[PDB]
């Protein structure tokens, strides 16, 4: 049975997502323009990631209990989850019609070629597409999508976490909300093993995060590429 507290948690996270995800993509005009061995898409996609980081921080701040953590722990959690939550939240714009992230317009529709033109390789891009396809196929309720993003952010095993017991206590409240939501509100057959499949997406994200950081380190080690990043991206992903 979904308790009053669990229904409240879901309502907060749905509101938080509403306040931090703009399905009109209006702000994309502000980024450096996309250009389709030159990394022609790096300025645009770095600006897009920088913008997305700001949205993920805004969502995180509204997760019940996140503000009770120390500043150090909030920082560790956001730095370690940012690319994973961006990959998750990007699934909303992903389409299996042509395996692209379609942000409202042809200029802002990104395929595997565009991602390679920001400097990433098939080692990341192939499993990233497989993740987007597998997540899209779960046909998550919006409630499950926002819970999964929150559980991803509040992970007690991230490196450098200090108060791992409090992080785990916050995450457990979200995990039990999600498990009870699936059991009470997701009708079969779509609910079949859904919680385990969602946790599997969190394990897939760790692998994607490790590969992203490897390729980010390689690309940002070249100062000509670092010059095209943003200050926020350099702070979050490293310098």
């Amino acid at each position: 049975k979904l308790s009053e507290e669990q229904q409240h948690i879901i309502a907060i996270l749905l509101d938080a997502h509403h306040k931090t995800y703009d399905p009109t993509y209006a702000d994309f005009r502000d980024f450096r323009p996309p250009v389709r061995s030159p990394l022609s898409m790096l300025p645009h996609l770095a600006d897009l990631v920088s913008y997305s980081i700001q949205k993920v921080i805004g969502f995180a701040k509204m997760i019940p209990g996140f503000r009770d953590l120390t500043s150090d722990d909030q920082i560790v959690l956001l730095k370690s989850s940012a690319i994973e939550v961006i990959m998750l939240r990007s699934n909303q714009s992903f389409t299996m019609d042509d395996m692209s992230w379609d942000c409202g317009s042809q200029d802002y529709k990104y395929d595997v070629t565009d991602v390679s033109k920001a400097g990433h390789t098939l080692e990341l891009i192939e499993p990233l597409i497989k993740f987007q396809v597998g997540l899209k196929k779960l046909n998550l309720h919006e409630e499950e999508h926002v819970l999964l993003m929150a559980i991803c952010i509040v992970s007690p095993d991230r490196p450098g976490v200090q108060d791992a017991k409090l992080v785990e206590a916050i995450q457990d409240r979200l995990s039990n909300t999600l498990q009870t939501y699936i059991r009470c509100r997701h009708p079969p057959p779509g609910s079949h093993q859904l919680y385990a499949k969602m946790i599997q997406k969190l394990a897939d994200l760790r692998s994607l995060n490790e590969e992203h950081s490897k390729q980010y380190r390689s690309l940002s080690f070249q100062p000509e590429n670092s010059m095209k990043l943003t200050p926020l991206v350099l702070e979050v992903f490293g310098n």
Binding site: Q54, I57, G58, K61, S71, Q74, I75, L78, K79, P231, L232, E235, V236
Partner: peptide, 11 residues
């Protein structure tokens, strides 16, 4: 380990 932009966005 100075994260002034993150710190500032966190409040």
């Amino acid at each position: 380990k100075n994260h002034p932009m993150l710190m500032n966005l966190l409040k």
